[PDB]
């Protein structure tokens, strides 16, 4: 099987920039390479055949070159929904192969989080297990600490975070942080709260409740 | 339009079959080959085999043994089975077509059909509200759906039907210690519209058939 | 990098 090296794994750059994707071949394949854009929870899309070739539909501001081994997908300015991973593929060689492909992220400007906090449901209770939600909204960059405390007690090893992909219109995250403790547990504490410490914030900013109204 | 629509997320137990059907319009199974192409964490992108217009097929070399492909051309229909699975197997699996017969630029995507391979028994989700009160901050208000327990994945959510997209986050779900997955989903809207405006989370959770809208009100 | 089958893109 041909080997198709792709690199950098990773590339950030900031809108109106340049940027060159590469795919190295094993060997010799000429010009059978083609380029597909995949995005947050998509398909691969069709972006350039052979190496050079227009696909219907797609911006101008993509295009390839390369013939032999050293193949290159360019962008000429990066827009916010540029935001995805980027394949090629080769079909000089049976059967046909795909790089392990580029992460491209777009630089922006520092974001806050905007902060919120949930308390369990009446509904979930019932089932003897309390979830209390921290949201950290479109933010930028995306490392970002949440402290839970419950009565002044340091919570840890309770709690998992999710983080969404770039944002494709301004490029920014969001986290989820939810505490899971048991109905018995939540029931005997009062003041829940989630301190989130990042970049945008000159101080950690705390979203609390007490439990019971 | 060409359109490639493929059958629903499975479970498939360790040594099992996997079985899924794409559904093809906008052209012919007689004009055009399908091609069956998967995406695991492991091996990436890595194409597994063909059936062409006249009915011949191709597998890759490691598949050979344990892939079928067959069709209906009357009923626009290409079947992919796929024998003995592995945990390695778990991944999306598409069909697609390339923009000529004998190609394989492939222009057309089916949706992916995402394969657990696991012993583990399915499991549908519970719903939970995430409810705002004063969530509310330069008068944005924050509310959401906590979409909790359920296997295997995936799990589907939107607002209002498809009718509310700006603002809406649905996060990655997580893999809790019991071996269950667990996510959120939330949108922010202006504070004032709490009191006309109706917000629910259309949660959809196929390989369990868990179809449920829940309502999320201020308390 | 690999692919994420929870997110569904590349995870680094
Ligand atoms: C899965 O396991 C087999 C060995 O049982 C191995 O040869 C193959 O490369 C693996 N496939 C992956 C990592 O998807």
């Known amino acids: 099987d041909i080997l198709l090296t792709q690199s950098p794994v990773i590339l950030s750059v900031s809108p109106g920039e340049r940027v060159s994707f590469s795919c190295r071949a094993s060997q010799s394949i000429g010009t059978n390479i083609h380029w597909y854009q995949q995005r947050t929870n998509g398909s691969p899309r069709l972006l350039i055949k052979y190496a050079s070739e227009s696909i219907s539909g797609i911006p101008s501001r993509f295009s390839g070159s390369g013939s032999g081994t050293d193949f290159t997908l360019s962008i000429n300015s990066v827009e916010s929904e540029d935001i995805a991973d980027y394949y090629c593929?080769?079909?000089?060689?049976?059967?046909?192969?795909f790089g392990a492909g580029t992460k491209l992220e777009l630089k922006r400007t520092v974001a806050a989080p905007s902060v919120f906090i949930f308390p369990p449901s009446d509904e979930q209770l019932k089932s003897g297990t309390a979830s209390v939600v921290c949201l950290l909204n479109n933010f930028y960059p995306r490392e970002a600490k949440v402290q839970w405390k419950v009565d002044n007690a340091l919570q840890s090893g309770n709690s998992q975070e999710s983080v969404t992909e770039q944002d494709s219109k301004d490029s920014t995250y969001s986290l989820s942080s939810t505490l899971t403790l048991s109905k018995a547990d939540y029931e005997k504490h009062k003041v829940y709260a989630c301190e989130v410490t990042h970049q945008g914030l000159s101080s950690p900013v705390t979203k609390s409740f007490n439990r019971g109204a | 339009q060409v359109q490639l629509k493929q059958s629903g997320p499975g479970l498939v137990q360790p040594s099992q079959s996997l079985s899924i059907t794409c559904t093809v319009s906008?052209?012919?199974?007689?004009?055009?080959?399908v091609h069956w192409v998967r995406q695991s964490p492991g091996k990436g992108l890595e194409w597994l085999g063909v059936?062409?217009?006249?009915?011949?097929?191709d597998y890759n070399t490691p598949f050979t043994s344990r892939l079928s492909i067959n069709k209906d051309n009357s009923k626009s229909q290409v079947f992919f089975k796929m024998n003995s699975l592995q945990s390695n197997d778990t991944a999306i699996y598409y069909c697609?077509?390339?923009?000529?017969?004998?190609?394989?630029?492939?222009?057309?995507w089916g949706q992916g059909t995402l394969v657990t391979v696991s012993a583990a028994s399915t499991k549908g989700p519970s719903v939970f509200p995430l409810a705002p009160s004063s969530s509310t901050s330069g008068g944005t208000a924050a509310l959401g759906c906590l979409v909790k327990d359920y296997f295997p994945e995936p799990v589907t959510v939107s607002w209002n039907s498809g009718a509310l997209t700006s603002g809406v986050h649905t996060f990655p779900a997580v893999l809790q210690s019991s071996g269950l997955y667990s996510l959120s989903s939330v949108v922010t809207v202006p504070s004032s519209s709490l009191g006309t405006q109706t917000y629910i989370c259309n949660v959809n959770h196929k390989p369990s058939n868990t179809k449920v809208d829940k309502r999320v009100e201020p308390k | 990098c690999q692919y994420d089958l929870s997110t569904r893109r590349l995870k680094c």
């Open positions: 697609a077509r390339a923009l000529t017969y004998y190609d394989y630029e492939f222009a057309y």
């Open positions: 906008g052209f012919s199974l007689t004009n055009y080959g």
């Open positions: 593929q080769q079909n000089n060689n049976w059967p046909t192969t």
């Open positions: 059936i062409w217009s006249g009915g011949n097929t």
